[PDB]
């Protein structure tokens, strides 16, 4: 579940925004420590939040993966990224989940919303969900 101290956009940033993420097995602990579950798959975009908020102004499209949402936007550029796959579902403890690291450089797709009152006023619209990379 999203930790209450984070807006949707801030949780998106924890999960998907890191210019210099550690190795997946380490990088995933911060995310996983909150939900008491190891996320099966996750992607860190190696850019900063302002660039992803910019994507929100591109053409509004149906989310290609999570097709219940209508507020997605595709990036116009490739970004470097680090993708993480859970290797050992059934790990006895969160700290023992291990991930395979898959670096890449791709376009991405985000769903956006008007910002939470707790979000920076720099971003009237914010990304709240990483839909997919390609």
Residue 14: is it exposed, middle or buried by C-beta count within 10 angstroms (0-12/13-18/19+)? middle
Out of 70, 73, 83, 129, pick the active-site residue: 129
Residue 70 a catalytic site member: no
Q: Which domain covers residue 31, as residue numbers?
A: 1-134
From the annotation, which residues make up the binding site for substrate? Answer: 39-43
* ∠ CA 17-12-111, rounded to 5°: 110
Report the binding-site residues. Answer: 39-43
The total number of structural domains that make up the chain: 1
Taking alpha carbons only, the member of 115, 99, 117, 134 closest to residue 13 is: 115
């Amino acid at each position: 579940m999203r930790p209450p101290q984070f807006t949707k956009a801030q949780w998106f940033a924890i999960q998907h925004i890191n210019v210099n993420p550690p190795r997946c097995t380490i990088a995933m602990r911060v995310i996983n420590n909150y939900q008491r579950r190891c996320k099966n798959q996750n992607t860190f975009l190696r850019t900063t939040f302002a660039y992803t908020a910019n994507v929100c102004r591109n053409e509004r499209i149906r989310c290609p993966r999570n097709r219940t949402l209508h507020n997605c936007h595709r990036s116009r550029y490739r970004v470097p990224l680090l993708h993480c796959d859970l290797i050992n579902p059934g790990a006895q403890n969160i700290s023992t989940c291990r991930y395979a690291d898959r670096p890449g450089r791709r376009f991405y797709v985000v769903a956006c919303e008007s910002r939470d009152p707790r979000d920076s006023p720099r971003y009237p619209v914010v990304p709240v969900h990483l839909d997919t990379t390609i």
